[PDB]
Symmetry: C4
Subunit: 90 residues, 4 copies
């Protein structure tokens, strides 16, 4: 489960990185950062400048938000929770 959501999230972020670096002309790291803060809904960066970028982002949000949060919901409930929960047992 976690591993699958892990791969699915990675692929989604790779696509975004490739897209924004190419179409919005961002350095790969900045393209990855934008992809991440967009799908996690933080949105702390300026928006895309091109219409292609705006259209892709709209679709990217609708298709990727569900996945990204599904992964986060498991990364903290099925991986981070035990490490602390079990450790909370003397």
């Amino acid at each position: 489960e976690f591993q699958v959501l892990f791969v699915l999230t990675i692929l989604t972020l790779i696509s975004g990185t490739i897209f924004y670096s190419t179409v919005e002309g961002l350095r790969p790291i900045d393209a990855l950062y934008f992809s991440v803060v967009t799908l996690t809904t933080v949105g702390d960066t300026p928006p895309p400048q091109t219409d292609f970028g705006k259209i892709f982002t709209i679709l990217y949000i609708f298709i990727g938000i569900g996945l990204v949060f599904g992964f986060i919901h498991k990364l903290a409930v099925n991986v981070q929770l035990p490490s602390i929960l079990s450790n909370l047992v003397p």
Copy 2:
């Protein structure tokens, strides 16, 4: 279900597109983009400049956030999930 949330989301976005292009003077694509990143709570664009825009946005958020995320919750759990889940079966 999915089709209904599909239509409801579309109509909500159409209203926002019409509103922001008219009142905030945005090009349709930019009006749609603002509507989308606002309802999905990304919020990566500058805020509305007019008081009418601010008031509408406040109401738009409260009335549209629930719907938009309801659609996303189905688009990934009742449409994207199987495609990958079933395919995860050798």
Copy 3:
């Protein structure tokens, strides 16, 4: 239920409106807008300029996010849902 969350949300927003208009010197409408986009996590406006504003905002987020989304979760599931659901019945 809905009415209680309605009042609780209103009071929370009134406090924010009073706070930001006074401490950050915002016009009431802008103070309300900031309060709304902050608690709904849209965050499309610049951040507070004063330390008092930053501290209050941190506490305001932790105490108000839960309430605001609780209200939204009811406004769309216990009020907007039927209007369309029942109407979806020929």
Copy 4:
């Protein structure tokens, strides 16, 4: 439960405060503010300027969002809810 999520959230925010003040050169209060609005997904501030800051933020979001919202979900359902719910009983 609440106390544990309380401590876990505090530690997470302390790490962010130390990180951003050091690497992004922010005053402690601003470092804390950025950490808070990032993990709660408000994202109303400009993004990190350094690559180290961008990389850390990406990891910080994925590891901290789950925890922070877990704490919020309890702070309003297991602490703020009763205070008003029980009080809603004549």
